[PDB]
Amino acid sequence: RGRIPGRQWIGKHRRPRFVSLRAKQNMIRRLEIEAENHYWLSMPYMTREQERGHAAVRRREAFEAIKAAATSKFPPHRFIADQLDHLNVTKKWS
Amino acid sequence: SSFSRAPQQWATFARIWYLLDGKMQPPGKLAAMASIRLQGLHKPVYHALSDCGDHVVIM
Amino acid sequence: TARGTPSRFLASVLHNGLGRYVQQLQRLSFSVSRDGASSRGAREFVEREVIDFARRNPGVVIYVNSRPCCVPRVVAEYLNGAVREESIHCKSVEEISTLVQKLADQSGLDVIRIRKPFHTDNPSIQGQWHPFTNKPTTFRGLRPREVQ
Amino acid sequence: MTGKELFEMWKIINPMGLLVEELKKRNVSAPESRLTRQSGGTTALPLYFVGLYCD
Amino acid sequence: LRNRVTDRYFRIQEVLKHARHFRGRKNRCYRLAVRTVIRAFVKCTKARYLKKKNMRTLWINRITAASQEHGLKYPALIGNLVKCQVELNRKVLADLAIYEPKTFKSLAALASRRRHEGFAAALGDGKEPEGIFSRVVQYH
Amino acid sequence: TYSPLPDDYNCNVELALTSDGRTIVCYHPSVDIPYEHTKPIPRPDPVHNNEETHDQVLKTRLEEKVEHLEEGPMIEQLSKMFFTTKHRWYPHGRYHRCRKNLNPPKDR
Amino acid sequence: GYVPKTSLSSPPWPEVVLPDPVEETRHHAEVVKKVNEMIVTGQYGRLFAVVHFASRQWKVTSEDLILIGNELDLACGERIRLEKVLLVGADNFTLLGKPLLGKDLVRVEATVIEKTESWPRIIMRFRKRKNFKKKRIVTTPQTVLRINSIEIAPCL
Ligand SMILES: [Mg+2]
């Protein structure tokens, strides 16, 4: 008898939903966290002119390491030991 | 105790008869307690397959 | 699947840890081949680590048969009559050593579903719960709606 | 003996007589049995708790 | 017919040995047995989450039963046991409720004492002793 | 004085805190059921099988109890006696009868 | 601040008066003394403990077995002291930690009895109409511990 037109939660006529106490309290506590975040993002420490180049050396070194890893690429070494010890497959009593 | 095992089991899983009174009580508040003690949800030994239900006599 | 397999409870063999611990492994019997690529790990295990294993635990009797076989094997026999057979076919020496150490570590009980991983024989000390625990008494034991 | 009750290795026959003579040895007068608890008497599944009282 | 399959029976048995306890034609016929065994193994894998959840629910029910036997409520008991710094989980709490009723009564009494102390604290802001089963122990 | 829980059932609980304050001590001896709270065991001695002529006529009369019922009334009687439902007492097929474990695992 | 008695004038719950702190401190002292003298005389038998071990809490007593789901790097037959005891109870008394009891108070011993693996556990993944089917078999390591003794010391 209580019939909603097709696909309850989409369309022109939808099944109504209402907000409980849970949802309001959850929203309020997340808003409180956000407000405290706003507070703590309000007092910087280096005013954007004092941070001009304080990490440039370290970032350059990091990218140099990245490039060294990217360019140190080559086929691995090949040894006589593996080719010769494949002969151990037929090692009988000795 | 030390309760030889068969008497111990019988005592643990024995059925209890409870008396509950109507006389101006709300039927649903009576039914809540009746359902609890008919299912056996009032015993720390409760399980669904243990058949640990009790008798409720509502007058 | 548990519903498609047997089950048992956690248990010991003869109350192993109560008095003295005893090694439940009784015998290890090895079938290894003189020739044959599959018995090479077993061959080197017998060459090096079988003697040290026997010296390490002397409650276990180890036999090595050295017969022509396509599949080398180890048979573990336990004090409770349990027999377990394992294939050491085409296994490395470290694999075989781990296998034999595991065999010496286990007991003879079946490796099936264990069903409640604890076994207490005295589950209650203050008395098991019954519907009359936590229930007060009445004068003269008078049940509800009584007269005398 | 672990996990076994005393009367699973002794296998006594008359516990009341044994207790009576033990109390006679210990100079304890007599145990009288009283119904301490009960739940259902007219049903096929009764529960009785009987307590023994000495003096 | 160069190299046709010879050991198909052993693969059929590999699937069929997990269907022996089924009912109907799916305990013997591979075409239906394979589907039902696939579903059974998926159920076996998914059932671990439900086993954990259901065992925790059983512990909660048993603890609620015992606490109501002692007159307490489950949230009050759990919260005040946390506040007394006694960190027993639902499993061992139900274990004690079934097998150590004296210990469980002592635990419920301690939780009720802590709850009353919390009420007195909410009334009087400490002033002086802030309760005795309060006073958490500090660690460094 | 003050008690968190009533000390008349199952325990006499006292809660203490050590001087160091790091451990809680719970003392809880058992409470006995007092004699005034018990009733005497009944002693029924029914003897009405003695007629003035014989003495083994009552021994014969002792084996006079026998009764047979069909499935319907028997199941109704069992259900009434054990406060169960009728479905408990109908039989099961051979499949269910033979797929039941007759040697189940034993704990304790 | 006076209100005539009604159904809402006063809270439904009873009014609770907690005991006075100094007399309660003396009462706690005497209760701890009584429990300690019971311990020194040996008025206990067959006590149990709750032990935190391998991310789990175990209700152990003497003589029983515990199965823990990983290796321990111990030989079979090795005796071990099980620390992290948070409850120990005998008949008529119980000791609680906040959250752990002291080292000097309790001493739980356990011997390693069996090192094994579990039965095979099937891990099957399936999605319909997607050709999505995967299967694993896992056997986790396992250790069996036999609890030998739970001792208590008068240092209360
Ligand atoms: Mg629709």
PDB file of N, CA and C in Angstrom, chain C residues 8-18 109 114 116-122, chain F residues 107, chain G residues 58-68 110-114 143-148:
ATOM      1  N   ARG C   8      38.063 -32.569  16.386  1.00  0.00           N
ATOM      2  CA  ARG C   8      38.455 -33.104  17.683  1.00  0.00           C
ATOM      3  C   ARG C   8      38.669 -31.930  18.626  1.00  0.00           C
ATOM      4  N   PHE C   9      38.952 -32.240  19.882  1.00  0.00           N
ATOM      5  CA  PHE C   9      39.250 -31.232  20.886  1.00  0.00           C
ATOM      6  C   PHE C   9      40.748 -31.188  21.159  1.00  0.00           C
ATOM      7  N   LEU C  10      41.205 -30.047  21.666  1.00  0.00           N
ATOM      8  CA  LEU C  10      42.609 -29.900  22.024  1.00  0.00           C
ATOM      9  C   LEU C  10      42.945 -30.837  23.174  1.00  0.00           C
ATOM     10  N   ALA C  11      44.036 -31.581  23.032  1.00  0.00           N
ATOM     11  CA  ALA C  11      44.359 -32.603  24.013  1.00  0.00           C
ATOM     12  C   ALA C  11      45.838 -32.936  23.930  1.00  0.00           C
ATOM     13  N   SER C  12      46.324 -33.599  24.970  1.00  0.00           N
ATOM     14  CA  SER C  12      47.659 -34.161  24.992  1.00  0.00           C
ATOM     15  C   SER C  12      47.572 -35.668  24.778  1.00  0.00           C
ATOM     16  N   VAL C  13      48.726 -36.323  24.771  1.00  0.00           N
ATOM     17  CA  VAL C  13      48.764 -37.767  24.585  1.00  0.00           C
ATOM     18  C   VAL C  13      48.677 -38.499  25.915  1.00  0.00           C
ATOM     19  N   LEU C  14      49.592 -38.201  26.832  1.00  0.00           N
ATOM     20  CA  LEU C  14      49.634 -38.845  28.137  1.00  0.00           C
ATOM     21  C   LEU C  14      49.938 -37.817  29.214  1.00  0.00           C
ATOM     22  N   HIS C  15      49.303 -36.648  29.120  1.00  0.00           N
ATOM     23  CA  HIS C  15      49.604 -35.505  29.980  1.00  0.00           C
ATOM     24  C   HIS C  15      51.091 -35.154  29.892  1.00  0.00           C
ATOM     25  N   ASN C  16      51.496 -34.731  28.691  1.00  0.00           N
ATOM     26  CA  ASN C  16      52.915 -34.583  28.379  1.00  0.00           C
ATOM     27  C   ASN C  16      53.589 -33.560  29.285  1.00  0.00           C
ATOM     28  N   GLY C  17      53.025 -32.363  29.376  1.00  0.00           N
ATOM     29  CA  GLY C  17      53.652 -31.287  30.110  1.00  0.00           C
ATOM     30  C   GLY C  17      53.428 -31.280  31.603  1.00  0.00           C
ATOM     31  N   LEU C  18      52.698 -32.254  32.144  1.00  0.00           N
ATOM     32  CA  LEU C  18      52.398 -32.243  33.570  1.00  0.00           C
ATOM     33  C   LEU C  18      53.602 -32.664  34.398  1.00  0.00           C
ATOM     34  N   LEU C 109      48.810 -36.663  17.345  1.00  0.00           N
ATOM     35  CA  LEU C 109      47.392 -36.374  17.201  1.00  0.00           C
ATOM     36  C   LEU C 109      47.079 -35.857  15.801  1.00  0.00           C
ATOM     37  N   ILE C 114      40.465 -28.037  15.340  1.00  0.00           N
ATOM     38  CA  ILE C 114      40.817 -28.215  16.747  1.00  0.00           C
ATOM     39  C   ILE C 114      39.680 -27.876  17.705  1.00  0.00           C
ATOM     40  N   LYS C 116      37.820 -24.999  19.569  1.00  0.00           N
ATOM     41  CA  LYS C 116      37.971 -24.327  20.861  1.00  0.00           C
ATOM     42  C   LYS C 116      39.378 -24.502  21.422  1.00  0.00           C
ATOM     43  N   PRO C 117      40.319 -23.652  20.985  1.00  0.00           N
ATOM     44  CA  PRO C 117      41.743 -23.877  21.259  1.00  0.00           C
ATOM     45  C   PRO C 117      42.154 -23.705  22.712  1.00  0.00           C
ATOM     46  N   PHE C 118      41.464 -24.387  23.618  1.00  0.00           N
ATOM     47  CA  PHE C 118      41.909 -24.500  24.997  1.00  0.00           C
ATOM     48  C   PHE C 118      41.211 -25.702  25.603  1.00  0.00           C
ATOM     49  N   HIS C 119      41.923 -26.395  26.484  1.00  0.00           N
ATOM     50  CA  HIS C 119      41.394 -27.565  27.154  1.00  0.00           C
ATOM     51  C   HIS C 119      41.644 -27.456  28.654  1.00  0.00           C
ATOM     52  N   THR C 120      40.649 -26.963  29.379  1.00  0.00           N
ATOM     53  CA  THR C 120      40.722 -26.993  30.830  1.00  0.00           C
ATOM     54  C   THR C 120      39.900 -28.157  31.372  1.00  0.00           C
ATOM     55  N   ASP C 121      40.464 -28.861  32.351  1.00  0.00           N
ATOM     56  CA  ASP C 121      39.753 -29.942  33.019  1.00  0.00           C
ATOM     57  C   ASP C 121      39.055 -29.490  34.291  1.00  0.00           C
ATOM     58  N   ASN C 122      39.368 -28.292  34.783  1.00  0.00           N
ATOM     59  CA  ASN C 122      38.703 -27.696  35.940  1.00  0.00           C
ATOM     60  C   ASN C 122      38.279 -26.290  35.544  1.00  0.00           C
TER      61      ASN C 122
ATOM     62  N   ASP F 107      34.676 -33.502  25.170  1.00  0.00           N
ATOM     63  CA  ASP F 107      35.449 -32.535  25.935  1.00  0.00           C
ATOM     64  C   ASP F 107      35.254 -32.817  27.418  1.00  0.00           C
TER      65      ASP F 107
ATOM     66  N   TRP G  58      43.721 -15.061  28.155  1.00  0.00           N
ATOM     67  CA  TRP G  58      43.415 -16.462  28.396  1.00  0.00           C
ATOM     68  C   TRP G  58      43.026 -16.637  29.854  1.00  0.00           C
ATOM     69  N   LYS G  59      41.883 -17.272  30.087  1.00  0.00           N
ATOM     70  CA  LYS G  59      41.476 -17.691  31.426  1.00  0.00           C
ATOM     71  C   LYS G  59      42.103 -19.052  31.688  1.00  0.00           C
ATOM     72  N   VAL G  60      43.243 -19.064  32.366  1.00  0.00           N
ATOM     73  CA  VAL G  60      43.999 -20.288  32.581  1.00  0.00           C
ATOM     74  C   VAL G  60      43.908 -20.688  34.044  1.00  0.00           C
ATOM     75  N   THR G  61      44.106 -21.977  34.285  1.00  0.00           N
ATOM     76  CA  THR G  61      44.293 -22.525  35.620  1.00  0.00           C
ATOM     77  C   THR G  61      45.491 -23.463  35.558  1.00  0.00           C
ATOM     78  N   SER G  62      45.744 -24.248  36.594  1.00  0.00           N
ATOM     79  CA  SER G  62      46.828 -25.206  36.476  1.00  0.00           C
ATOM     80  C   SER G  62      46.379 -26.421  35.669  1.00  0.00           C
ATOM     81  N   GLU G  63      47.353 -27.085  35.048  1.00  0.00           N
ATOM     82  CA  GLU G  63      47.248 -28.390  34.395  1.00  0.00           C
ATOM     83  C   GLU G  63      46.635 -28.359  32.996  1.00  0.00           C
ATOM     84  N   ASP G  64      46.205 -27.214  32.473  1.00  0.00           N
ATOM     85  CA  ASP G  64      45.448 -27.204  31.226  1.00  0.00           C
ATOM     86  C   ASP G  64      46.306 -26.735  30.056  1.00  0.00           C
ATOM     87  N   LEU G  65      45.678 -26.703  28.882  1.00  0.00           N
ATOM     88  CA  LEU G  65      46.351 -26.473  27.616  1.00  0.00           C
ATOM     89  C   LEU G  65      45.813 -25.217  26.948  1.00  0.00           C
ATOM     90  N   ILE G  66      46.691 -24.544  26.210  1.00  0.00           N
ATOM     91  CA  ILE G  66      46.356 -23.339  25.464  1.00  0.00           C
ATOM     92  C   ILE G  66      47.005 -23.443  24.092  1.00  0.00           C
ATOM     93  N   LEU G  67      46.235 -23.175  23.045  1.00  0.00           N
ATOM     94  CA  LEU G  67      46.739 -23.208  21.679  1.00  0.00           C
ATOM     95  C   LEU G  67      46.865 -21.779  21.171  1.00  0.00           C
ATOM     96  N   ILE G  68      48.082 -21.386  20.811  1.00  0.00           N
ATOM     97  CA  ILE G  68      48.356 -20.049  20.306  1.00  0.00           C
ATOM     98  C   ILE G  68      48.774 -20.166  18.847  1.00  0.00           C
ATOM     99  N   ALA G 110      54.439 -21.986  32.166  1.00  0.00           N
ATOM    100  CA  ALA G 110      53.887 -22.771  31.075  1.00  0.00           C
ATOM    101  C   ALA G 110      55.025 -23.422  30.307  1.00  0.00           C
ATOM    102  N   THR G 111      54.825 -24.679  29.936  1.00  0.00           N
ATOM    103  CA  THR G 111      55.806 -25.415  29.155  1.00  0.00           C
ATOM    104  C   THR G 111      55.302 -25.575  27.729  1.00  0.00           C
ATOM    105  N   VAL G 112      56.231 -25.530  26.783  1.00  0.00           N
ATOM    106  CA  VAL G 112      55.907 -25.752  25.378  1.00  0.00           C
ATOM    107  C   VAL G 112      55.813 -27.254  25.148  1.00  0.00           C
ATOM    108  N   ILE G 113      54.679 -27.702  24.612  1.00  0.00           N
ATOM    109  CA  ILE G 113      54.385 -29.117  24.519  1.00  0.00           C
ATOM    110  C   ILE G 113      54.298 -29.608  23.077  1.00  0.00           C
ATOM    111  N   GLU G 114      53.890 -28.760  22.138  1.00  0.00           N
ATOM    112  CA  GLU G 114      53.729 -29.187  20.757  1.00  0.00           C
ATOM    113  C   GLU G 114      53.889 -27.992  19.832  1.00  0.00           C
ATOM    114  N   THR G 143      51.385 -23.302  18.463  1.00  0.00           N
ATOM    115  CA  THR G 143      52.116 -23.775  19.628  1.00  0.00           C
ATOM    116  C   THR G 143      51.130 -24.130  20.729  1.00  0.00           C
ATOM    117  N   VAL G 144      51.391 -25.246  21.401  1.00  0.00           N
ATOM    118  CA  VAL G 144      50.580 -25.709  22.516  1.00  0.00           C
ATOM    119  C   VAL G 144      51.375 -25.479  23.792  1.00  0.00           C
ATOM    120  N   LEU G 145      50.757 -24.803  24.751  1.00  0.00           N
ATOM    121  CA  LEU G 145      51.364 -24.500  26.037  1.00  0.00           C
ATOM    122  C   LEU G 145      50.566 -25.182  27.135  1.00  0.00           C
ATOM    123  N   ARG G 146      51.251 -25.927  27.988  1.00  0.00           N
ATOM    124  CA  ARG G 146      50.637 -26.511  29.171  1.00  0.00           C
ATOM    125  C   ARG G 146      50.977 -25.647  30.376  1.00  0.00           C
ATOM    126  N   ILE G 147      49.953 -25.141  31.055  1.00  0.00           N
ATOM    127  CA  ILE G 147      50.177 -24.327  32.244  1.00  0.00           C
ATOM    128  C   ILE G 147      50.479 -25.261  33.408  1.00  0.00           C
ATOM    129  N   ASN G 148      51.633 -25.066  34.039  1.00  0.00           N
ATOM    130  CA  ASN G 148      52.093 -25.977  35.075  1.00  0.00           C
ATOM    131  C   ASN G 148      51.721 -25.507  36.475  1.00  0.00           C
TER     132      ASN G 148
END
